[PDB]
Design a binder for this molecule. Structure first.
Ligand SMILES: [Cl-]
Ligand SMILES: [Cl-]
Ligand SMILES: [Cl-]
Ligand SMILES: [Cl-]
Ligand SMILES: [Cl-]
Lengths: 359, 366
């Protein structure tokens, strides 16, 4: 029945933890972005908030995990590792895949996918295993981390993010809450090859530092989707379509290398190859994830995370899917290119891949 | 650093009704009792202790921040809002993860477990999908009532014959009075609480849960209290501790389900796991397909055409209850023990997972 297209996509600026957005309750920050995505659509159209038929938000990131607490409650030995599958990576692209599918199914004509990150075993270890596995060094990740920072700085200098960002009003917070608008990503960082060479690895025997991994950050994003002809009837312009999608199980012991599989599978579904893709957005939680993915697929690295990624911009993990779709779409439009691949970790030990085409 | 994962022990607690026999236990007490029982069972005839376990992985557990946000920005109340989450539980994911970590050589001994419980302090989206799945395949009110009656009969027969005795770890729980207040007493609970005398006439009288629907309380399962756990080892490590390998995973598959038919995943996950194993449906001796809704099972059956005498032979969730968060471990545990009881070789386990995923697993008794 339906033909889903993206008509508007927006993100908040990304704030540091305890930074410029920290004075907002998670519900207020998400709410601002839900409203902004509707208001953008309404600027030269008939669309109103009550025309949204379904909103689907990604799961929220969360030891006190029930498996461990149970194990201790029964008197069992404390050295034993216990974890509970939850929302470690966020749901990645799931909300956007579900909204688009519900439109294709003819269940709804208008939907919003959204996500939020705020004040509402182990990741570095996995990222180090992924590095050793394919000979990724300390120097390799420092080069990549420097480049993400440079590209994000260049992107900001040239105003590349101006279209995609909804400015957000937030309280002063910090030391005094008595005092009663944020435009820019706060995580952008004034570092160099030498600076990065000085940093101490986060794990003994590791290659990643604070400069080649991202920190958890405050952010929200949302994507408004519509059936194509309903968009046209309301005077709104179709901007992108999903060409193919994939949701795959990652390797239990290399759980952050999922993008390798999800990229492979979504390309196969599309009948495409890496070189066909103009723009890639692959989440930069860890530099080794991207370099690992790149060593298998050997893309042109000048097309990968063109405006920087999470190492420079921050990692609002709960909205990653919408954040990456938002950034990819606006970079396709800015350069007038046709195809983007978006890939990332999801849930626990899953990865999603999505190919979109600008229209 | 390449292991060979095998199941060495699997146990499940009886399944209690909501506010029933296990409700006075905190989630952590109920899960903890089952984690400990799976270790104690393995330690009866071996050298194993709890401290030899290297990793425990439990499934995800279980108002929307999406809706609260939408409301706090002043937006319309009639708009539906949901959050992708742990609606179906993680199904088989914890068992797949423990086995994978052993195969990768990361650990030699691990426990997969799951819990469903509710602090003393299925939704309409689901029934809607289940009704879509029924109409799509011409499944009627009469069809699902026949299936629901049969689940109850099988469960009753299984209980009468003691079929569940080996698998179940009895659990000590607070006695609750008529008003759901504790008396101070604690009693060992042995039996699944959800079984009920059912007839075709009784079922025919029930009111559908949704306007125009075919499912009732008697052909859908209610959320229940339960936990289950499966102890996995590398086979050589099992032998070195004096334990016998009992089961192994032949093939496994995880599929993304249709967004608008999100409960029909078992059709695809079954197809794919059979293909990976080089098998057909008639090779499988025992199937465990989770009975959240009768239409899901009958839809699956219409595509794959199994012999239904091999399907949920000891009853399923319609009769036994639906402790969602431990479904994967519960079905693996029931399937393994029914292979051992009958001396048969292969079982297929299939169910919903996360939100709009489905898993299929083929296991062999060894
Ligand atoms: Cl999102
Ligand atoms: Cl509880
Ligand atoms: Cl009892
Ligand atoms: Cl489980
Ligand atoms: Cl299920």
């Amino acid at each position: 029945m339906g033909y889903p297209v993206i008509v508007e996509a927006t993100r908040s600026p990304i704030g540091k933890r305890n930074g410029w957005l920290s004075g907002l309750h998670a519900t207020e920050l998400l709410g601002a972005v839900q409203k902004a995505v509707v208001d953008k659509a309404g600027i030269q159209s008939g669309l109103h908030a009550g025309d949204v038929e379904q909103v689907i938000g990604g799961c929220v990131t969360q030891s006190n995990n029930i498996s461990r607490v149970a194990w201790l409650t029964a008197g069992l030995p404390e050295h034993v590792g216990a974890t509970t599958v939850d929302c470690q990576c966020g749901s990645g692209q799931q909300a956007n895949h579900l909204i688009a599918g519900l439109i294709a199914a003819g269940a709804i004509d208008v939907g919003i996918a959204c996500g939020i990150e705020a004040m509402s075993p182990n990741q570095f270890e996995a990222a180090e295993r992924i590095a050793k596995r394919r000979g990724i060094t300390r120097e390799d990740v420092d080069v990549f981390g420097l480049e993400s920072q440079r590209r994000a700085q260049r992107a900001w200098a040239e105003g590349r993010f101006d279209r995609e960002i909804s400015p957000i009003q937030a309280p002063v917070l910090d030391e005094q809450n008595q005092p009663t608008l944020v435009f820019r990503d706060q995580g952008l960082r004034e570092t160099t090859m030498a600076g990065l060479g000085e940093l101490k690895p986060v794990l003994e025997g590791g290659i990643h530092t604070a400069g080649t991994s991202s920190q958890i950050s405050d952010g929200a994003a949302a994507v408004l989707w519509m059936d194509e002809a309903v968009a046209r009837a309301h005077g709104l312009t179709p901007r992108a379509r999903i060409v193919a999608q994939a949701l795959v199980g990652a390797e239990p012991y290399y759980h952050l290398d999922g993008p390798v599989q999800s990229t492979a599978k979504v390309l196969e579904k599309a009948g495409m190859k890496i070189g066909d893709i103009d723009i890639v957005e692959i989440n930069e939680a860890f530099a080794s994830v991207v370099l690992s993915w790149a060593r298998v697929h050997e893309p042109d690295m000048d097309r990968v995370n063109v405006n920087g990624g999470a190492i420079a911009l921050g990692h609002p993990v709960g909205c990653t899917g919408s954040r990456l779709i938002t950034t990819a779409l606006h970079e396709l439009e800015r350069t007038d290119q046709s195809l983007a691949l978006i890939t990332m970790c999801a849930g626990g030990a899953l990865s999603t891949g999505t190919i979109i085409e600008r229209i």
